[PDB]
Amino acid sequence: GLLAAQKARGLFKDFFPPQTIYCGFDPTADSLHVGHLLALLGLFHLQRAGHNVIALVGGATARLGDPSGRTKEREALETERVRANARALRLGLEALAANHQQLFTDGRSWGSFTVLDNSAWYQKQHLVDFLAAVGGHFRMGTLLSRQSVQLRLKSPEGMSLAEFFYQVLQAYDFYYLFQRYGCRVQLGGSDQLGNIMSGYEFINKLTGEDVFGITVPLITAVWLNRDKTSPFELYQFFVRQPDDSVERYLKLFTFLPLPEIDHIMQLHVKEPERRGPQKRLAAEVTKLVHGREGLDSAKRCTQAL
Amino acid sequence: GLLAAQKARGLFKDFFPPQTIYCGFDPTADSLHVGHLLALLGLFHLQRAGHNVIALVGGATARLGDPSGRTKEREALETERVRANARALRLGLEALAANHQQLFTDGRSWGSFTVLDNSAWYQKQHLVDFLAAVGGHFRMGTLLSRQSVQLRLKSPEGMSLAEFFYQVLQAYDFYYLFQRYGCRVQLGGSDQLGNIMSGYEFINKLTGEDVFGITVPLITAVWLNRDKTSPFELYQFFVRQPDDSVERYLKLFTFLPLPEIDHIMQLHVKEPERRGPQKRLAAEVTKLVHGREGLDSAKRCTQAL
Ligand SMILES: Nc1ncnc2c1ncn2[C@@H]1O[C@H](COP(=O)([O-])OC[C@@H](N)Cc2ccc(O)cc2)[C@@H](O)[C@H]1O
Ligand SMILES: Nc1ncnc2c1ncn2[C@@H]1O[C@H](COP(=O)([O-])OC[C@@H](N)Cc2ccc(O)cc2)[C@@H](O)[C@H]1O
């Protein structure tokens, strides 16, 4: 099964409670990083399986900032720096989706991939109208009882109004896309369980409609941007890896079928000195983020050493 | 002293922690009532004393509804019915201010009286911008700890997001007028202690500036609108009054100096059958709300009976 393969690979951590699925990426920087990569893959796996996916840029929401999993209040971001980053991200996601569509074809009939931005619909949204329209459908108890929200709420200083209100936007986003694109599935890291929850409860209060969430593991400075992190630098992060991990990361960052992976490892023991599973993971990934060129301008770089 | 006379009269309940002072009136109906009258007098007393006052219509805030002192959630109001009422109120306050400026002159140099509406500045306010601009200055603990807010919060059903967010707007209003009109005093009934609090703390977080609040007693169906409640009907509310009260209501709803009042009462005992203090209170008030005509078309009405 589709979900089977992904839960099995270790990509689809959990789920609650032709389709359309989405995941958001807050443009709090101009570059995506290796962690973002994992959520994005989740989309790529659903896309290959034939589904339509939407990778959303948080032009609006990054002005505020996600409180989720954070113990400290963020440095409010200049409304313009966030506008820039949002345009960098869009570019970055169309870029990735680009490599993925040529360098990893499988003859399967694929689904669409679309980059949206929530600023598009927030720029037409006036405070009291929003509040008047929806505010009456968010029970305060509900919002107050997210586990995502305790680190900041229960903090010594407390949580700004903004931080708290953040979840409400994300909840609304899910509602919006669901309305306009019939999208009934949201996906993100585990840190996003709370927010997604708000979404499906909210949608459920309004329409008896059942939508869904899916999470993926969180992995534990590494940029998808050639400018920030060279294709070579990036290769090194995946090559300098412990053997106990290269197992999971293969199942994590690559499309190699599980059997192909299996062999790679069983083979690795007959040749531990080879760093073979790393030389594979590193290749697969750098191919996806930086294209064939990037792989080459990294293969080459190390080799001479 | 000015505050002395008002605290003494029983009009200036409390205060915390040429000037400009304001009080808001939510257009949840097209008519003001006798209770509103008290808060408005508070303004009139400050205005006679020479100060500039602003009677604010809550065009925006009445769409939500004030949670303060309420045990139950309000029936969400049609955004259009609220627009109509807001235009009725503006008319009603310019009307009262009218009678007050002819039928109650005292040769003193008076201060300005201005009717504003918050919808004016909320209609230009976009959700994320507001949240982005200010949301970070409202500690959630603060907002969560108003006594105004417990009846609804601690309720079995809980409080909508809207109800809770209400205080935030009122807090912002005070900040707005203070910015634009250097207004540094807000006044309302006692039920409004909480909200006003939010205002001066918020202003204080932003500017070390000290602004202030003043409250007035709450009195315990009676419309300032000739259409709803005839000038005669209204006279009867003030005439059908217990002697233990006519004392306070004179000090409450009239401008008669305290000595003049004193006599009226000491006189009343020599003639209890006269209902003299009531025939005075009733006259004073009906004169202010319905003008000389109204007094007459009420004096006349009863007399023939
Ligand atoms: N190191 C990592 N390892 C694994 N996963 C990671 C890692 N870092 C980030 N992620 C995941 O990838 C996404 C990154 O977006 P974000 O700006 O960090 O989350 C903010 C998001 N709430 C923005 C949003 C906006 C609008 C919306 O509708 C939905 C969501 C999120 O789904 C997040 O859970
Ligand atoms: N029976 C009564 N006796 C004495 N006083 C009474 C009585 N009834 C009402 N009041 C007072 O008169 C005013 C009426 O406003 P309101 O819509 O009832 O409260 C809502 C308010 N938040 C409106 C507002 C809107 C915007 C804003 O910025 C400030 C305020 C308030 O100051 C209220 O406390």
Curated annotation (Swiss-Prot), chains A, B:
Effect listed in the UniProt record for changing residue 145 to E: Loss of tRNA ligase activity
Top EC class for this record: ligase
Gene Ontology CC terms: cytosol; mitochondrial matrix; mitochondrion; nuclear body
Span of the annotated motif 'HIGH' region: 27-36
Compartment(s) where it occurs, according to its Swiss-Prot or TrEMBL record: Mitochondrion matrix
A GO biological process held by the record: translation
Protein residues bound to L-tyrosine: 22, 66, 166, 170, 173, 192
Documented EC number(s): 6.1.1.1
Gene Ontology MF, one: L-tyrosine binding
Superkingdom as given in the UniProt entry: Eukaryota
Residue ranges of the TM segments: none
Binding site for ATP: 26, 189-191, 219
Keywords attached to this entry: Acetylation, Aminoacyl-tRNA synthetase, ATP-binding, Disease variant, Ligase, Mitochondrion, Nucleotide-binding, Primary mitochondrial disease, Protein biosynthesis, Transit peptide
Subunit (UniProt): Homodimer.
Function: Catalyzes the attachment of tyrosine to tRNA(Tyr) in a two-step reaction: tyrosine is first activated by ATP to form Tyr-AMP and then transferred to the acceptor end of tRNA(Tyr).
Disease: Myopathy with lactic acidosis and sideroblastic anemia 2: A rare oxidative phosphorylation disorder specific to skeletal muscle and bone marrow. Affected individuals manifest sideroblastic anemia, progressive lethargy, muscle weakness, and exercise intolerance associated with persistent lactic acidemia.
Family label: Belongs to the class-I aminoacyl-tRNA synthetase family.
Protein name: Tyrosine--tRNA ligase, mitochondrial
Residue numbers of the full-length protein present here: 37 to 373 of 477
